[PDB]
């Protein structure tokens, strides 16, 4: 759904990125995050470019999804939905993580 640029499978609301309050949308080929009130995703990472996904679980008042890229880069997506902030993380995790091998080397 939310095919404004690509087919979004997982829509994660109340997500922030380094002082930017917005929303995270996982599309078929890329994880794109946009600011709340913006029609355009200011961040879009293809699962290919995402070298690894790290995620801070309960314990901290800040649940975060850090997309560590190949070069050593990263993308800090803070799940700030007081309701299911961590549960969001887990779903975005299980999904994105499964989205990765799709953009990784196959059996050969």
């Amino acid at each position: 759904m939310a095919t404004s640029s690509e087919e979004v499978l997982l829509i994660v609301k109340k997500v922030r990125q380094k002082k930017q309050d917005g929303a995270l949308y996982l599309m078929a080929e890329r994880i794109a995050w946009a600011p709340e009130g913006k029609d355009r995703f200011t961040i879009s990472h293809m699962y290919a470019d995402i070298k690894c996904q790290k995620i801070s679980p309960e314990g901290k008042a800040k649940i975060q999804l850090q997309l560590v890229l190949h070069a050593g880069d990263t993308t800090n997506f803070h799940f700030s939905n007081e309701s299911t902030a961590v549960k969001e993380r887990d779903a975005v995790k299980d999904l994105l993580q499964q989205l990765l091998p799709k953009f990784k080397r196959k059996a050969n």
Binding site: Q17, D21, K62, N76, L100
Partner: protein, 127 residues
């Protein structure tokens, strides 16, 4: 705007590296004894065949049930036995265990991978 994403240092990032489609490796274990499951009865999950083990309880299952029961009573669990001075979870649990008054299902496991459910009520505890 929230400067909370730069107000941290050491985020407890539960590193999640995807790795699906890996090998099983049956040799990836260290146990080979009777690893039994200590479950609280009332739901009573049991199989539908004759059991192959013995309806007796040694110091293995006893101590396991006792430790788990002391943990229960230590949390203010109701006592199922008579009190003749027993004011400690261990004493009470020992009385309950010896009388099979402890409601707990002990699922035994064999080195072959099989498992059999065994309630304390079905086990003759030899102190």
């Amino acid at each position: 705007m929230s400067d909370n994403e730069d107000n941290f240092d050491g985020d407890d990032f539960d590193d999640v590296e995807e790795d699906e489609g890996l090998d099983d490796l049956e040799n990836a274990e260290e146990e080979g004894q009777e690893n039994v499951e200590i479950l609280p009865s009332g739901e009573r999950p049991q199989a539908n065949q004759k059991r192959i083990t013995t309806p007796y309880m040694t110091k293995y299952e006893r101590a396991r049930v006792l430790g788990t029961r002391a943990l229960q009573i230590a949390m203010c669990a109701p006592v199922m036995v008579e009190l003749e001075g027993e004011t400690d979870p261990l004493l009470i649990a020992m009385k309950e265990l010896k009388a099979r008054k402890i409601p707990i299902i002990i699922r035994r496991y064999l080195p072959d991978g099989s498992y059999e459910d065994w309630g304390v009520d079905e086990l003759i505890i030899t102190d």
